[PDB]
């Protein structure tokens, strides 16, 4: 997260770190057994880390649970990033508390202009690299489809939306991928892609979760 703030320990209780020996992506806990992330975050050997604040220090609220199954969306196209969503099933159920909690799936797509909370452990610089140990947060509005399409001509599908600030300076970034965009207490986006981070006229692009709710429900009901 570039231009954001320190969330505070366990103030984003659905945020997960995906770990393959190191943090590599975020995700969102959606029930005690399932995590939503980005398909471009796929790899084998995932351990889901719940109740994290500092990802390098055991602070006492962590639950480390290996993935039993990863399911990339059937129509994920890594060339275009269309359908950039995956589900991760945990080997055992998380113990839900005030600091480890699920986030609700949307019923309707979020409104443009709604201020959303985006979070993660990704790069905090738009030039150069600096990765935080504690969770960072950003508040950013959903942009209109016309501004999104203008920013990225020929690249925005109906399964994507833009959020952020056209002036630059505030954005998600590398390492935030797969993490949540929460608007009105619903998981409306997944950190997906963008052209660098926090660049003028290049807002963040996010997987439109509302388009996937039927698939998520069907998949969870059968796995
Ligand atoms: Ca920790």
Curated annotation (Swiss-Prot):
Disulfide bonds join 7-137, 25-41, 109-210, 116-183, 148-162, 173-197. Binds 1 Ca(2+) ion per subunit. It catalyses: Preferential cleavage: Arg-|-Xaa, Lys-|-Xaa. Subsequent cleavage after Lys-125 leads to alpha-trypsin. Further cleavage after Lys-170 yields pseudotrypsin. A cleavage may also occur after Arg-99. Its EC number is 3.4.21.4. Synthesized in the acinar cells of the pancreas. GO terms for molecular function: endopeptidase activity; metal ion binding; serine-type endopeptidase activity; serpin family protein binding. SMART domains: Tryp_SPc (SM00020). The active site is at 40 (charge relay system), 84 (charge relay system), 177 (charge relay system). One of its GO terms (biological process) is digestion. Residues 1-221 form the Peptidase S1 domain. It is found in: Secreted, Extracellular space. Its cofactor is Ca(2+). It comes from the Eukaryota. Substrate binds at residues 171-172, 174-175, 177. InterPro entries: Peptidase_S1_PA, Peptidase_S1_PA_chymotrypsin, Peptidase_S1A, Serine_Proteases_S1, Trypsin_dom, TRYPSIN_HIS, TRYPSIN_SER. Keywords: Calcium, Digestion, Disulfide bond, Hydrolase, Metal-binding, Protease, Secreted, Serine protease, Signal, Zymogen. Its main location: secreted. Pfam families: Trypsin. Ca(2+) binds at residues 52, 54, 57, 62. SUPFAM superfamilies: Trypsin-like serine proteases. Is inhibited by scorpion cyclotide trypsin inhibitor TopI1. One of its GO terms (cellular component) is extracellular space. Belongs to the peptidase S1 family. Interacts with SERPINA1. This is Serine protease 1.
């Amino acid at each position: 997260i570039v231009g954001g703030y320190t969330c505070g320990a366990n103030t984003v209780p659905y945020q997960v770190s995906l770990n393959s020996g190191y943090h590599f992506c975020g995700g969102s806990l959606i029930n005690s057994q399932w995590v939503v992330s980005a398909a471009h975050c796929y790899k084998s050997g995932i351990q889901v880390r719940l109740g994290e604040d500092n990802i390098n220090v055991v602070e006492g609220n962590e639950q480390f649970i290996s993935a039993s199954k990863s399911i990339v969306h059937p129509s994920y196209n890594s060339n275009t990033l269309n359908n950039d969503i995956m589900l991760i099933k945990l080997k055992s159920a998380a113990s839900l508390n005030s600091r480890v909690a699920s986030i609700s799936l949307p019923t309707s797509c979020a409104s443009a202009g709604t201020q959303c909370l985006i979070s993660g452990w990704g790069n905090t610089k738009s030039s150069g690299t600096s990765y935080p140990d504690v969770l960072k947060c950003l508040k950013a509005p959903i942009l209109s489809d016309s501004s999104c399409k203008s920013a990225y001509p020929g690249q925005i599908t109906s399964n994507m939306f833009c959020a952020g600030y056209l002036e630059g300076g505030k954005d998600s970034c590398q390492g935030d991928s797969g993490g949540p965009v929460v608007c009105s207490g619903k998981l409306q986006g997944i950190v997906s892609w963008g052209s660098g981070c926090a660049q003028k006229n290049k807002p963040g692009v996010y997987t439109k979760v509302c388009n996937y709710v039927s698939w998520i429900k069907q998949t969870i009901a059968s796995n």
